[PDB]
Amino acid sequence: PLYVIDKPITLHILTQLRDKYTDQINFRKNLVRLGRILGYEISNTLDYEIVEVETPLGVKTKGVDITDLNNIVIINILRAAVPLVEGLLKAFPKARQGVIGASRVEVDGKEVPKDMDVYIYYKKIPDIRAKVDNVIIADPMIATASTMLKVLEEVVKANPKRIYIVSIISSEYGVNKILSKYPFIYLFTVAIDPELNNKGYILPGLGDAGDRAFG
Amino acid sequence: PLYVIDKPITLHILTQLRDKYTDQINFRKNLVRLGRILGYEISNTLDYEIVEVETPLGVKTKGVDITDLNNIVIINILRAAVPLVEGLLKAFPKARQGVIGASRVEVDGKEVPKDMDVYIYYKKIPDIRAKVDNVIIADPMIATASTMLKVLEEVVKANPKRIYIVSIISSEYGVNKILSKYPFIYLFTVAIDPELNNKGYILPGLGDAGDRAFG
Amino acid sequence: PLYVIDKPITLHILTQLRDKYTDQINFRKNLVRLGRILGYEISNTLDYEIVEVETPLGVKTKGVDITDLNNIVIINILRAAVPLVEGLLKAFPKARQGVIGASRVEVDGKEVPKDMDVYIYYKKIPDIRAKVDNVIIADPMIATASTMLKVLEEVVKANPKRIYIVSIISSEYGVNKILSKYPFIYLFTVAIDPELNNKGYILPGLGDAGDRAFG
Amino acid sequence: PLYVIDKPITLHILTQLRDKYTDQINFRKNLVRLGRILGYEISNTLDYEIVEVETPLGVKTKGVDITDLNNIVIINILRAAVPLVEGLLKAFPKARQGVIGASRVEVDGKEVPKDMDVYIYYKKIPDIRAKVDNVIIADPMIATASTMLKVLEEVVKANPKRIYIVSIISSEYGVNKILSKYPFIYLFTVAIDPELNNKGYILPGLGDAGDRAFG
Ligand SMILES: Nc1nc2c(ncn2[C@@H]2O[C@H](COP(=O)(O)OP(=O)(O)OP(=O)(O)O)[C@@H](O)[C@H]2O)c(=O)[nH]1
Ligand SMILES: Nc1nc2c(ncn2[C@@H]2O[C@H](COP(=O)(O)OP(=O)(O)OP(=O)(O)O)[C@@H](O)[C@H]2O)c(=O)[nH]1
Ligand SMILES: Nc1nc2c(ncn2[C@@H]2O[C@H](COP(=O)(O)OP(=O)(O)OP(=O)(O)O)[C@@H](O)[C@H]2O)c(=O)[nH]1
Ligand SMILES: Nc1nc2c(ncn2[C@@H]2O[C@H](COP(=O)(O)OP(=O)(O)OP(=O)(O)O)[C@@H](O)[C@H]2O)c(=O)[nH]1
Ligand SMILES: O=P(O)(O)OC[C@H]1O[C@H](OP(=O)(O)OP(=O)(O)O)[C@H](O)[C@@H]1O
Ligand SMILES: O=P(O)(O)OC[C@H]1O[C@H](OP(=O)(O)OP(=O)(O)O)[C@H](O)[C@@H]1O
Ligand SMILES: O=P(O)(O)OC[C@H]1O[C@H](OP(=O)(O)OP(=O)(O)O)[C@H](O)[C@@H]1O
Ligand SMILES: O=P(O)(O)OC[C@H]1O[C@H](OP(=O)(O)OP(=O)(O)O)[C@H](O)[C@@H]1O
Ligand SMILES: [Mg+2]
Ligand SMILES: [Mg+2]
């Protein structure tokens, strides 16, 4: 399932992020912001049940309860996901948090075509309850999806109820590469960019979210 | 224009607010929360223009810019709007803030039928630019709309570009009373309750938002 | 008890507030900020008890518990206290909130000397438990103290355990006028300005906090 | 320079963190909280200059300006520092952010005495301006200081103006091991615990801040 959250509010922030004349304080702050907005979108897609409450004037009345806000396992993909996951926690307070690190298998002869043999050098995920939890992998940029797919490779094994992916900008290539392989995946993103260059950088993109937000 | 923002996320919070076993910290915090969510809805309805930005890799590209986030005049209707306006400011940072106080013309013989001759005892609004600003009157509860209409009576005179109304719960009666009189009004609300009793209290409602949030 | 919280961090923000080239977003945001900082100062003066907790490795160990964070009644003095009280709530989540409005008894012949016969036109305070609660009246500016003293006049009657006053800038005159009358009062403030002019405006002051923050 | 920020407000939160009956939402939230409080302490120790501003009524007047809030390089030591650094950013918005990962040189024969040959497997620090920046390394727990010293080993090389260390709980052993080696270091911490066991765990401590906050 593809969800392209391109409303005015989100395209407004996305524009600020794109703009290179946007300093670090603002670039970082916008990541957190979207995190909370896309965090809200995913919320309106989670499993909920109808409940009954009793108002003050004593009137038992129906209501909704997103019981699944109790089964959230967010997975922070360093280094740029951090700020994104910050805003995500504002929507999923009850989430356990996984941390993952991945590096392109250092080749030597610049090759990044469709695959840069990614490799995990850090992994710390809480227990994922099979067919119960809703895993949410966060990473602002999905370019060649080498990273994402490598992370998924491991998550899929846990067999959680649902698997969500939250990115700001993902590439034409990267979105199809993922969904074709894992069609049951709920992929949320704000914009889907046409192409990526021969270095794996997304175009038009927005530069390096990691350095833009940290350095 | 009526906008009933009844998505799962908003009906979820609304349910917590309804529930009388919800303490003050949480009841108040949920008002602020919705304020920011309904603040986001109104944002996706504001006038924006297409802009062009230059990414880092040097790619001039299109984007949206809600220029109207610059022309916002929020109007806080004491006493319960305060918390609501708190979250609203998180969506409209550039807004000037009006403060208003209204009291039912103290009669003596309990009468609240369709009108309780409301009266303004406090008023402090910034300058409202005719046909430029977008006025946003905030008040969680719209019951008989005596208060709202009394406030509008004064705002309409300013002749702003648009006029929005943000309420959590508004009554069948109160919504129609307002829109029939002022059809051009963008009325945002989460739920619209069937009826109000003979004291002007909304049913099923959620009790007194003012005392629930303050006392 | 006078507490002049003039540390670098607070004098830094106070300076920004003083500066007239500080827009509304920043001026307002700094009020909230100080609110939370002065909110922290008052916290280190509240009654607490020593407690014992059991760490994970199973080690019962001592700790402090500011039990009095449970007995807080904040009193928001319109119109400028609002933003200040916003940050104050971030330190005292468990506080009930009073709202008060006061106006100089509209004379005609500009007189503001030592007294401008203030008058309350709005009042909504929760129940204040005698000798239990710690009342905290918030108002960024204490000039002639006509407002403050008028508000206190009513609060003193409740006979709460303690009474705190949180202001950003208070005048030489206003501070002494209050403490001399009510010596048991814990008055917190960042700076105490030399004098106020013949209109009741503080000098050097920082202008109208109300219009600076709202309009 | 040792700074033990053991005020009631900080010992209050520290107590909640110690307490094993404190869930994840609250344990994590308290880390962020302290981050902002200890972030404020360090602020009152930074180099500032006296400035002059012009109030509204037109009165040039003195003020303080912590110019050094412009030269902050925070260094997040995974995995627990994340939440701590979250609150730290609320005090140092203008900071560049370094990320570091360290692992005990996997031996085989449980030995952790005074040194567990630590090893860095991840490092991404922005440029540190020699004798200009104020580096702030964040890590809630300083036990044997193997991690801290290993991180410092690299930071010292940059020769920044000042080097701060922000921890919640640090051990008798770890504090002296660091300051003896690097006496010019400004070490901030809330509590200093007596001893650590033979596994490197602090006593009384508060358990694993990483798993307490993430899993
Ligand atoms: N039990 C508990 N939950 C908290 C507390 N603080 C935050 N939370 C939860 O964490 C979520 C996000 O919290 P924060 O990081 O403080 O975010 P925020 O900017 O305050 O956002 P909102 O609280 O939604 O307005 C909230 O929606 C709450 O569900 C706390 O002190 N206690
Ligand atoms: N220029 C400026 N704008 C600010 C500052 N702090 C907040 N704002 C603006 O005010 C809005 C809401 O700010 P806050 O009350 O801090 O809300 P928040 O919980 O931090 O929410 P977000 O900043 O959106 O994540 C933001 O979206 C900003 O546009 C500040 O220090 N400087
Ligand atoms: N039980 C409960 N308490 C909350 C919640 N959100 C906030 N609080 C309390 O309210 C205080 C201030 O909350 P906020 O207005 O969200 O402030 P904040 O900017 O998030 O500040 P901190 O939570 O202290 O980091 C906190 O210190 C909490 O004690 C919530 O969802 N549940
Ligand atoms: N220019 C700019 N600075 C911002 C903005 N939002 C936050 N900041 C800065 O970042 C700091 C911490 O911001 P947040 O993470 O929003 O923290 P917060 O809970 O809102 O805390 P306070 O803003 O201090 O009340 C602030 O003190 C500001 O200096 C923004 O929209 N624009
Ligand atoms: O889809 P892919 O082509 O794999 O690219 C996406 C990933 O690459 C970048 O991380 P990087 O390794 O540059 O580290 P960073 O997190 O510090 O940016 C980016 O932050 C994503 O994590
Ligand atoms: O549509 P209406 O029938 O006019 O009712 C709605 C208004 O009444 C209540 O205010 P109240 O006067 O009770 O003061 P409060 O703000 O302290 O609740 C409520 O908070 C609204 O402001
Ligand atoms: O010590 P005093 O001389 O009485 O002055 C202090 C009070 O005066 C101002 O309120 P104002 O009536 O101007 O309304 P405002 O809250 O909108 O600023 C100020 O905001 C204080 O509330
Ligand atoms: O002073 P030391 O004895 O070196 O111990 C302190 C460090 O050890 C822990 O990290 P850990 O390696 O357990 O990973 P974590 O960050 O996930 O807790 C802790 O979070 C500190 O980072
Ligand atoms: Mg909060
Ligand atoms: Mg903010």
Domain map of chain A by residue range? 1-215
What are the structure tokens assigned to A70, written together?
A: 């109790």
Provide the annotated binding site of B for uracil.
202, 207-209
- Distance (Å) from the alpha carbon of D60 to chain C's nearest alpha carbon: 8
Q: What is the DSSP string of chain B?
A: -EEE---HHHHHHHHHHH-TT--HHHHHHHHHHHHHHHHHHHHTTS--EEEEEE-TTS-EEEEEE-GGGGSEEEEEETTTHHHHHHHHTTT-TT-EEEEEEEEE---SS---SS---EEEEEEE-----BTT-EEEEE-SEESS-HHHHHHHHHHGGG-BSEEEEE-SEEEHHHHHHHHHH-TT-EEEESEEESEE-TTS-EES--S-HHHHH--
Q: What is the DSSP string of A133-146?
A: -EEEEE-SEESS-H
Q: Which residues line ligand 3 (CB under 6 A)?
A: B 25-26, 29; C 90, 93; D 29, 32-33
Residues within 8 A of C (CB atoms), D 12-41 only: 12, 14-15, 18-21, 37, 40
Tell me which DSSP letter residue C200 carries.
Answer: S
Q: Torsions phi, psi of C108, nearest 5? A: 165, -45
Q: Is the CB of A143 under 6 A from ligand 5?
A: yes
Beta-strand pair A134-138/A72-77: parallel
In chain D, the residue whose alpha carbon lies closest to the alpha carbon of A214 is D97
Burial environment of residue B199 by CB neighbours within 10 A (0 to 12, 13 to 18, 19 or more):
exposed
Beta-strand pair D195-196/D202-203: antiparallel
The residue written with tokens 């006593």 in the block is D203
What are the structure tokens assigned to C167, written together?
A: 């202001």
The residue written with tokens 């200009």 in the block is D132
Please tell me which of the candidates D11, D65, D208 has its beta carbon nearest to residue C15. D65
In chain B, the residue whose alpha carbon lies closest to the alpha carbon of A67 is B12
Answer whether A8 sits within 8 Å of B48, measured CB to CB: yes
Query: Who contacts D176 (Cβ-Cβ below 8 Å, separation ≥6)?
Result: none
Are the CB atoms for A32 and D100 separated by under 8 Å?
no
Ligand 10 centroid to Cα of residue D84, in Å, is 17
Mark out the alpha helices in chain C (DSSP H runs): 8-18, 24-43, 81-88, 146-155, 172-181, 209-213
> CA A94, A97, A98: angle at the middle one, nearest 5?
155
Closest CA to B206 of A58, A66, C94: A58
- Closest atom of ligand 7 relative to the B99 alpha carbon: 17
Q: How far is CA B18 from the centre of its chain?
A: 18
Q: Is B200 left (phi over 0), alpha (psi -120 to 50) or beta?
A: left
Alpha-carbon gap, residue A92 to A86, rounded angstroms: 10
> CA A137, A46, A148: angle at the middle one, nearest 5?
15
> What is the C-alpha radius of gyration for chain C, rounded to an integer number of angstroms?
18
Burial environment of residue B90 by CB neighbours within 10 A (0 to 12, 13 to 18, 19 or more):
middle
The residue written with tokens 């910050």 in the block is A86
Ligand nearest to the Cα of B208, by number: 6
Q: What is the DSSP string of chain D?
A: -EEE---HHHHHHHHHHH-TT--HHHHHHHHHHHHHHHHHHHHTTS--EEEEEE-TTS-EEEEEE-GGGGSEEEEEETTTHHHHHHHHTTT-TT-EEEEEEEEE---SS---SS---EEEEEEE-----BTT-EEEEE-SEESS-HHHHHHHHHHGGG-BSEEEEE-SEEEHHHHHHHHHH-TT-EEEESEEESEE-TTS-EES--S-HHHHH--
Write out the E strands in A17-71: 49-54, 60-65
Sheet holding B141-142, edge to edge: B141-142, B169-171, B191-193
Amino acid at D141: M
Q: What is the DSSP string of A152-195?
A: HHHHGGG-BSEEEEE-SEEEHHHHHHHHHH-TT-EEEESEEESE
Tell me if chain C has a CB within 8 Å of the CB of D195.
Answer: no
Architecture per CATH, domain A1-215, reads as 3-Layer(aba) Sandwich (3.40)
The residue written with tokens 């094994």 in the block is A157
The HSE-up count of residue C190 (CA atoms within 13 Å, CB side) is 33
Q: How far is CA D101 from the centre of its chain?
A: 15
Q: Torsions phi, psi of D179, nearest 5? A: -65, -35
Alpha-carbon gap, residue A73 to A36, rounded angstroms: 16
Answer whether A215 sits within 8 Å of D82, measured CB to CB: no
Segment (H or E) for A131: none
Are the CB atoms for B179 and B185 separated by under 8 Å?
yes
Segment (H or E) for C214: none
Alpha-carbon gap, residue C89 to C67, rounded angstroms: 16
Alpha-carbon gap, residue B14 to B4, rounded angstroms: 12
Burial environment of residue D167 by CB neighbours within 10 A (0 to 12, 13 to 18, 19 or more):
buried
The residue written with tokens 């309409």 in the block is B156
What method did the depositors use to determine the structure?
A: X-ray
Alpha-carbon gap, residue D3 to C114, rounded angstroms: 46
Segment (H or E) for A122: strand A118-124
Please tell me which of the candidates D97, D122, D213 has its beta carbon nearest to residue A101. D122
The residue written with tokens 């358990």 in the block is D207
Q: Torsions phi, psi of A182, nearest 5? A: -130, 85
- Distance (Å) from the alpha carbon of B123 to chain A's nearest alpha carbon: 31
Burial environment of residue C188 by CB neighbours within 10 A (0 to 12, 13 to 18, 19 or more):
buried
Provide the annotated binding site of C for 5-phospho-alpha-D-ribose 1-diphosphate.
79, 104, 139-147, 208
What are the structure tokens assigned to D61, written together?
A: 């007047």
Ligand 3 centroid to Cα of residue C90, in Å, is 6
Residues within 8 A of A (CB atoms), D 59-88 only: 78-79, 82, 86
Number of Cβ within a 10 Å radius of residue A49? 10
- Distance (Å) from the alpha carbon of B60 to chain C's nearest alpha carbon: 30
Resolution in A: 2.8
- Closest atom of ligand 3 relative to the C90 alpha carbon: 12
Q: Is C58 left (phi over 0), alpha (psi -120 to 50) or beta?
A: left
Three-state secondary structure readout of A57-102: CCCEEEEEECHHHHCEEEEEECCCHHHHHHHHCCCCCCCEEEEEEE
Alpha-carbon gap, residue B16 to B30, rounded angstroms: 8
Answer whether A24 sits within 8 Å of D96, measured CB to CB: yes
What are the structure tokens assigned to C50, written together?
A: 């020593």
